């Protein structure tokens, strides 16, 4: 199968900004590259049909160029409604392979995240498992690192993040991470920390409870 | 209405072809259809129609037309036709049982052949299984003769292309010919391409 | 308008079978190639099959081949997917996608109009309505609470806050799935921390497919 990559991965701009996306084919696909725009929630929706062609109904702001294995998306002047992630696409041939897509997102002055963590419910360890949430709330941009330390001691593989999309009115993201132990495993340990690393903290934050105390 | 030509002007004069493996496909639609630049002899050794006599291409009104571009070896053009069973028809190009539409090919000893060898063109000669018509497999993957994922430089791990090499000086049959061949579609929309 | 309605998705056990549907109009149906695009929860596009016009040419991807058969009624303005053999790679979102060209080829072209999604999900969880835990908030001007929905089965769930009365700093994250094969989602909301106390936050959780309701109160902790 014929590799499709894209540069970059992540895209922060404002609105009139020129936007350029590169993509890439690991062969000659001639012209036949396709551009997709697809919004969160809702289908693909085609934009260039043949590395240049525009498709009928989508702004002229819009354009592609390139040939071989070289290929390009440019929006000339950018509009609030050009905020979604961007797919290319070789037709040349089968089986067809797109990119890994390129999200455009608005760009907002570097907010740091503020941090909670929560410890288990005294409901939830009765039913024999612990969940210990740490919150990374309204922080830009949303390339961020979440470390559970438990007694110092580092873990992996046990804890599961989800992040919202991008605010309509702060333009900040939202960051939860899960930790999930076995109660047998909670009861083990004292130290419960969160480690958040960030662009707009100096140094890592830390927030950490000792658990059989308070808050 | 329509008052285009169509670009087969671009696709027989065309500067470079490319090789049979990675043949091109310029579709051709919203014009009117010229033929008559075709029925120059002296020039294309072979002129051949399945589905409709050549003569009265002007008359006729098409959904779509295809123009297929390669180059392959003089003694190859003569599987480029339906029901044929060479390499290149089994693993390059194939053309429908049912296939409407004419196969040009001319000489190109002048402009495709050197004394030093033009090993530009290729073609592939190992594959697993044919190729339904229409088809294009524009893959170089190393090729065991019993399917599985091969890592050269080991053994039985083989390439599946391999270049002509066209020489000045060589047989008529080895000399390198450039084909086009014109596809007529017909579908349940109007018909965009007429003659005059 | 060219309209591409699709029908058919639900919840299979790996290795069960399904049939999808693409019920299309506003175009000469039988002039179009049509495909199968899928994405999975979180991730890029995927492309799975495609017909030809007459449906004399299919081709398959490699991870769907020999157990996904495409196939298309021209009196009927449908195109179909049946799916065997099914497995937990294979959930994703299906799209119906149109070639925009009308030709009886199939390369070179682009996808102009895509159908809006039948949701597939290939899992062996039995359906199982959420455990709703409180978050409850700590002891520096504002404070963070919320409820943890955990382990329910299938998608999706509602939350919401003080039944809808409550909604600026709410925010509801995208639900994980755990190894155990049930998802979890938690719902925060910033609050003023001279509220607490007085002020009572009721989370208003929903798991239609369970069919369960569950209105939970994070109260400050005891201490
Ligand atoms: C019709 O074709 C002849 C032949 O073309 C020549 O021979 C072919 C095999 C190919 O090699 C072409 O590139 C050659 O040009 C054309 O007549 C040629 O005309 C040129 C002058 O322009 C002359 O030098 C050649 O000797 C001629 N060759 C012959 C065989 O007469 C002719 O121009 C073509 N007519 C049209 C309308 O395309």
């Given at each position: 199968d014929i590799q499709m990559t894209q540069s970059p991965s992540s895209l922060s701009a404002s609105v009139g900004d020129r936007v350029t996306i590169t993509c890439r084919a690991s062969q000659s696909i001639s012209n036949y590259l396709n551009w997709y725009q697809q919004k969160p929630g809702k289908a693909p929706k085609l934009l260039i049909y043949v590395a240049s062609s525009l498709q009928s109904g989508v702004p002229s702001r819009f354009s592609g160029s390139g040939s071989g294995t070289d290929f390009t998306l440019t929006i000339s002047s950018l509009q609030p409604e050009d905020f979604a992630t961007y797919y290319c696409q070789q037709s040349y041939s089968t089986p067809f392979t797109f990119g890994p897509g390129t999200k455009v997102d608005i760009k907002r002055t570097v907010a740091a995240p503020s941090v909670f963590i929560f410890p288990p419910?005294?409901?939830?360890?009765?039913?024999?498992?612990?969940?210990?949430?740490?919150?990374?709330?309204?922080?830009?941009?949303?390339?961020?690192?979440?470390?559970?330390?438990?007694?110092?001691?580092?873990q992996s593989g046990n804890s599961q993040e989800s992040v919202t999309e991008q605010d309509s009115k702060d333009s900040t993201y939202s960051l939860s991470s899960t930790l999930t132990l076995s109660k047998a495993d909670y009861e083990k340990h004292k130290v419960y920390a969160c480690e958040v690393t960030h662009q707009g903290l100096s140094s890592p934050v830390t927030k950490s409870?000792?658990?059989?105390?308070?808050? | 209405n329509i008052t285009n030509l169509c670009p087969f002007g671009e696709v027989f004069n065309a500067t470079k072809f490319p090789s049979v493996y990675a043949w091109e496909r310029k579709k051709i639609s919203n014009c009117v259809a010229d033929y008559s630049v075709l029925y120059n002899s002296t020039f294309f050794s072979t002129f051949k129609c399945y589905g409709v006599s050549a003569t009265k291409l002007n008359d006729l009104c098409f959904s779509n037309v295809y123009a297929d571009s390669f180059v392959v070896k003089g003694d190859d053009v003569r599987q480029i036709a339906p029901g044929q069973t060479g390499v290149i028809a089994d693993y390059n190009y194939k053309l429908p049982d049912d296939f409407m539409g004419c196969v040009l090919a001319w000489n190109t000893r002048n402009?495709?052949?050197?004394?030093?060898?033009?090993y530009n063109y290729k073609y592939r000669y190992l594959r697993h299984g044919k190729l339904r018509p229409f088809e294009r497999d524009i893959s170089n993957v190393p090729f065991s003769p019993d399917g599985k994922p091969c890592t050269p430089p080991a053994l039985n791990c083989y390439w599946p292309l391999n270049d002509y090499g066209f020489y000045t000086t060589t047989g008529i049959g080895y000399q390198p010919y450039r084909v086009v061949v014109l596809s007529f579609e017909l579908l349940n929309a109007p018909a965009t391409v007429c003659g005059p | 308008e060219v309209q591409l309605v699709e029908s058919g998705g639900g919840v299979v056990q790996p290795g069960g079978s399904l049939r999808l549907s693409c019920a299309v109009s506003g175009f000469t149906f039988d002039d179009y190639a049509m495909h199968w695009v899928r994405q999975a929860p979180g991730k890029g596009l995927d492309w799975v099959s495609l017909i030809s016009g007459d449906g004399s040419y299919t081709y398959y991807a490699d991870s769907v081949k020999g157990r996904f058969t495409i196939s298309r009624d021209s009196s009927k303005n449908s195109l179909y997917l049946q799916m065997n053999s099914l497995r937990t790679e294979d959930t994703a979102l299906y799209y119906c996608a149109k070639a925009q060209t009308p030709?009886?080829?199939?390369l070179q072209d682009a996808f102009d109009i895509w159908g809006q999604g039948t949701m597939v999900?290939?899992?062996?969880?039995?359906?199982?309505?959420?455990?709703?835990?409180?978050?409850?908030?700590?002891?520096?001007?504002?404070?963070?609470?919320?409820?943890?929905?955990?382990?329910?089965?299938?998608?999706?769930?509602?939350?919401?806050?003080?039944?809808?009365?409550?909604?600026?700093?709410?925010?509801?994250?995208?639900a994980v799935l755990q190894s155990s094969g049930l998802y979890s989602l938690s719902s925060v909301v910033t609050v003023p921390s001279s509220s607490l106390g007085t002020q009572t936050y009721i989370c208003n959780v929903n798991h239609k497919p369970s069919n369960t309701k569950v209105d939970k109160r994070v109260e400050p902790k005891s201490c």
């Open positions: 419910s005294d409901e939830q360890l009765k039913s024999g498992t612990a969940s210990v949430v740490c919150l990374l709330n309204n922080f830009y941009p949303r390339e961020a690192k979440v470390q559970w330390k438990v007694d110092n001691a580092l409870f000792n658990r059989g105390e308070c808050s | 402009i495709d052949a050197t004394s030093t060898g033009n | 030709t009886l080829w199939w999900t290939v899992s062996s969880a039995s359906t199982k309505g959420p455990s709703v835990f409180p978050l409850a908030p700590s002891s520096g001007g504002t404070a963070a609470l919320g409820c943890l929905v955990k382990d329910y089965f299938p998608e999706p769930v509602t939350v919401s806050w003080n039944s809808g009365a409550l909604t600026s700093g709410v925010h509801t994250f995208p």
